[PDB]
Amino acid sequence: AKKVAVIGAGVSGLISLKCCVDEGLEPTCFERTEDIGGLWRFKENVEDGRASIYQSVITNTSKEMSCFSDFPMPEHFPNFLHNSKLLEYFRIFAKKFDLLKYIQFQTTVLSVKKCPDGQWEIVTESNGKEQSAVFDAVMVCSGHHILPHIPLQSFPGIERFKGQYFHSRQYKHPEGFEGKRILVIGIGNSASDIAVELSKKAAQVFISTRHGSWVMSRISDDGYPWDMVFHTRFSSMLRNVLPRTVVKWMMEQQMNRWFNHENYGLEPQNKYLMKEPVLNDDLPSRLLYGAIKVKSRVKELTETSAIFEDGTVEEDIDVIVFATGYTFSFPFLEDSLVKVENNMVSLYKYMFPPHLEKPTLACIGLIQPLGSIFPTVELQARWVTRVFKGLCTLPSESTMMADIIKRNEKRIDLFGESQSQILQTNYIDYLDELALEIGAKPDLLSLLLKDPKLAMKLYFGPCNSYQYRLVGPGQWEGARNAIFTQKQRILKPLKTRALKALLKILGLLAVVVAFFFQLQ
Amino acid sequence: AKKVAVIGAGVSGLISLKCCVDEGLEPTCFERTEDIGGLWRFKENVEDGRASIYQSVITNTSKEMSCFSDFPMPEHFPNFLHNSKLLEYFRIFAKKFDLLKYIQFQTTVLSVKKCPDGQWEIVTESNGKEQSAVFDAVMVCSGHHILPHIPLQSFPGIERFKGQYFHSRQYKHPEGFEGKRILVIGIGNSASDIAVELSKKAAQVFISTRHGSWVMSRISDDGYPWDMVFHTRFSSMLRNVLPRTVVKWMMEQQMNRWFNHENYGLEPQNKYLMKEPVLNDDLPSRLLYGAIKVKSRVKELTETSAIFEDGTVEEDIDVIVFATGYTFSFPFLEDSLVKVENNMVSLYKYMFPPHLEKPTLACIGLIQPLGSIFPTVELQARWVTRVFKGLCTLPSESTMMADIIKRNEKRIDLFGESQSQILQTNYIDYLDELALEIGAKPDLLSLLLKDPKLAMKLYFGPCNSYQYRLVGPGQWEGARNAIFTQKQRILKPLKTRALKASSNFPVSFLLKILGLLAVVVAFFFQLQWF
Ligand SMILES: Cc1cc2nc3c(=O)[nH]c(=O)nc-3n(C[C@H](O)[C@H](O)[C@H](O)COP(=O)(O)OP(=O)(O)OC[C@H]3O[C@@H](n4cnc5c(N)ncnc54)[C@H](O)[C@@H]3O)c2cc1C
Ligand SMILES: Cc1cc2nc3c(=O)[nH]c(=O)nc-3n(C[C@H](O)[C@H](O)[C@H](O)COP(=O)(O)OP(=O)(O)OC[C@H]3O[C@@H](n4cnc5c(N)ncnc54)[C@H](O)[C@@H]3O)c2cc1C
Which of A206, A437, B61, B227 suits a disulfide with B66, CB 3.0-4.6 Å? Predict the structure, then answer.
């Protein structure tokens, strides 16, 4: 393998592009649009084949918990990021790794067909007329938050509903919805952001759910980003090992510290599930202010109103917003290639079509982890480039089919059977999976004997992307360094005004048990 | 006394108006503007002689912690309120007590002058031509968040600063300031609300302070409003009695639960002070997002930039906003009457000019308590109507002057010497002061041999306005009731989605864990005779 194709200059495109030149492959990037970023490049209109965002989106993951393993975000960056500002990182990245030269913009990939397999033929239209070409391998990075899902079938009377309705996709700005009566269906992270945003200047906003999530702020312990508090090796273990109830018993408590979810009305049904909680710093407040009313699932619609699953009714609702998420297709692909059946994607680790005989194509970024996607797709590409070169090997088709089932089977009893969780996956565990396959997973215990400082920090502290550039192939020296100095780059954009100026309670109770244990 | 004048149809006007008809006085209300509410009536332009608000203001006190003692907010109201919605309560109130008939709108009070004292002569212009009249007593309710303070003298180079600047007062909407570099001066509750609002669609927002407050969310324990968790008789006592540090040591911890204030950069200088913390549910987040940068005090301005007290500089700042608060005047009053000198208002309990020989005039609402103003001005008016009638008596001038000093002296060592705290006052303590004067303050000790349920609830639970309509004059039956059922009226607008599930096995955590540890101490304490 040498000549590699990457579909889209997404985040996933941009990192694979880079992970290629690192394994010395020579890649070609095809971008439908005129620029990089994919979803995170905000545009005012909703252009086809690209994922839209509303203008005000902020990331739900820390910069030091979601940068590429060898490229910390500038120290002067905020810890959570406007879409504006994330883009900037991406641009800074593609400048610093000269990845822009491999990109062909406004060239959309129409078909990816197998030649007599170990290569692929790829048709791509440009200005009207459509060239073809041949590649040894191909990495798909065309995203999956593009094709809206609106299950109107399950909302009867929608046919009768006068007034306006649309899908989260189509939203961009709140202006236009001044003082209207607005029903948003579902408790997406997006639904929440939307609800909140519209709620300010709107008559009323409702927000339907049967299930109703746990809501959680990006702020955590001592105002540090939640991901660095929650995503820590040691903690992940406890979540895995402890009896599921003991864990649920703990989520319940931790989650309710902010507010009683029963009272605010979004207490879940099955707390059994480790379903992704929504990340909105604004929602609980906006509920107190009465800007938003949470509500049970819509049962039926009328021309002006909505009946609900708990018998209540909401009169004169001017606007419905279906934040009912997206589905996904690969309209340029053998329909048997990315087989998606009975609430299960048959791809070895959300990546490799198992029925292939030469392992020369993989989907990157077709995954929804519980941490940042950016370090996941980086590792996804470290694995995949090395597979392509042969440095790494897949198992048998029958082994790969056994995994796929067993994974997705656990996945189900861990996040429920909804086709909005197909791609849900525990965060660290998966990073580890990918890192093992290329032997970049640090062996913490082994790091006890040498550098017990690191050993501790890696286990008990926050699990950064940096950790994975410690051992195995492609290392970064600034990895020990990055990890040790993250606190600095966190506080740097925060502690922006300075004063200049449990101390003895800690010394005492420790010594007082050093008195307990000694006087024997 | 009978014919009473109330200057302004503020909240203060509207409650006194009511407190009058309750003591059978016949009042006349003079309203500069065309409608009630004063500050809380949002209008698009900043109309003179009335306090302006930006359009998006939300009350920073609970509905059940800030309703009038005998008029709960409707159950279907949210717990914190848009200005839009608070007005509604006020309107509902003035309808239910027929207070609207006493109001003369678009009649502004030009002078209040003493006749041969025990009455007052009051000139009021209407449409052009200005009638005079006479009243036995007069209650001033013209507010004090109207006259902007902008100490430009202390911000040198402001003369040189090109680009735009103005005062909090004149703010209304954020649209217009898209992607600009905006410096707001001070950490007002307002500054914060403004900063936050502008910050969303702005290039950058900074926010200057030397001192820098504690920031606090309206959300508290178990998502209940902060005021009902903080303003509780029992707790107030601990704050009063415990060594001031022990109390500071406690505020510091409680406050930082949300976030480390050192790290976010608004750690205060003197934590010694029980200074009012800002109430913004948005500010800490908006700092994480980097929408707002906190900064030390401005030292100097240039045409395009700002130097700062810690040597830093911020280039290309398009807009300064002075959220540097308000002062206050009474332009229709004897200059000797409301004497305001050396960081001290000489009014007996922020109310009565002591040099008066007949006690026939009082200011209501010239006070900034640490809880809701609405129950304070209600009690302010219960005291005052009764003074006017003679049912209640002031002490001597020399006694009233001794209090005033002693109060304002404590006030200083409790909130610092800044002329932005003149009117600061502990919340419950003051409610008690006013209630005592008319003997409506419940005695709990007594109230423990009868209704120990109430006795507990009153002390340990949240100190509502309702409490004060339990004893003394003007009672409400729906007072025991209101208090007992408040949890309902709180949850009613919240718990709007409901599970339906008798939780034993799946989710009833500290139900049996409480049963166990209580029985396990019923084992601890008993097993001494075995
Ligand atoms: C509201 C929201 C918030 C999120 N927040 C976070 C967060 O805080 N942290 C985090 O880690 N993740 C987050 N994510 C997830 C993740 O970052 C995004 O899904 C991510 O942008 C996906 O990037 P991608 O490159 O895989 O897809 P995209 O960015 O959509 O890339 C698709 C690219 O492919 C191009 N394309 C499509 N079809 C073709 C074709 N035939 N030929 C050529 N080009 C084509 C498009 O033009 C586009 O440039 C969030 C997602 C959402 C919806
Ligand atoms: C931003 C902000 C938020 C606040 N939030 C809260 C809160 O959440 N909870 C709380 O308890 N308190 C709060 N307060 C404190 C308090 O509610 C307000 O200060 C409120 O204005 C008090 O009303 P008032 O009647 O004293 O004064 P105002 O409402 O200012 O009364 C002025 C009225 O008198 C009239 N008037 C003035 N001069 C004359 C004249 N010469 N003749 C006739 N009429 C005249 C005016 O036209 C107007 O009708 C807040 C204050 C501010 C600034």
Answer: B61
> How does DSSP classify residue B281?
S
CA distances to A271, B283, B352, B415 from B348, in Å: 58, 38, 5, 19
β-sheet bridge partners, residue A30: A7, A104
Compute, in angstroms, the gap from residue A329 CA to the centroid of ligand 1.
14
Distance from CA of A478 to the nearest CA of B (A): 25
Q: Which amino acid is at B480?
A: R
Distance CA A454, CA A444 (A): 9
Beta bridge partners of residue A26, listed in sequence order: A3
* Experimental technique of record: X-ray
Which one of 3.40.50.300, 3.30.420.10, 3.50.50.60, 3.30.1330.10 gives the CATH number of domain A149-217+258-326? 3.50.50.60
In single-letter form, the type of residue at position A400 comes to M
Fold of B1-146+328-392+424-497: FAD/NAD(P)-binding domain (3.50.50)
Instruction: Determine the CATH number of domain B150-217+258-325.
Output: 3.50.50.60
> Which residues 6+ apart lie within 8 Å of B130 measured at CB?
B110, B123, B124
Spans of all domains in chain B:
1-146+328-392+424-497, 150-217+258-325
Task: Say yes or no: CB of residue A112 within 6 Å of ligand 1.
Answer: no
Q: Does A368 sit in the ligand 1 pocket, CB within 6 Å? A: no
CA B383/CA A63 separation, integer angstroms: 58
Instruction: Report yes or no: B367 and B359 within 8 Å, Cβ to Cβ.
Output: no
- The DSSP 8-state label assigned to residue B72 in this structure reads P
> How far does the centroid of ligand 2 lie from the alpha carbon of residue A356, in Å?
75
Which of A258, A310, A498 has the CB atom closest to B265's CB atom? A498
Q: How far is CA B487 from CA A285, B63, B122, B490, in A?
A: 18, 12, 46, 5
**Angle of helix B509-524 versus helix A244-256 axis, rounded to 10:** 100
Are A290 and B496 a contacting pair at CB < 8 A? no
Q: Is the CB of residue A6 less than 8 Å from the CB of residue A138?
A: yes
* Number of neighbours of residue B365 by Cβ within 10 angstroms: 28
Closest A-chain CA to B308: A497
Rounded to whole angstroms, the Cα distance separating B153 from B166 reads 15
Q: Which of B28, B34, B145 to mutate to test the pocket of ligand 2 (most atoms within 8 A of CB)?
A: B145
Please name the member of A222, A267, A496 whose beta carbon is closest to the beta carbon of B293: A496
Please state whether beta strands B147-148 and B326-327 pair in parallel, antiparallel, or not at all (unpaired): antiparallel
Out of A85, A223, A262, closest to residue B284 by CB: A223
One fold for B1-146+328-392+424-497 and B150-217+258-325: yes
**Cβ-defined contact of A289 to B58 (cutoff 8 Å):** yes
CATH of domain A3-146+328-440: 3.50.50.60
Residues 6+ apart with CB under 8 A from B524: none
d(CA A459, CA A462): 8
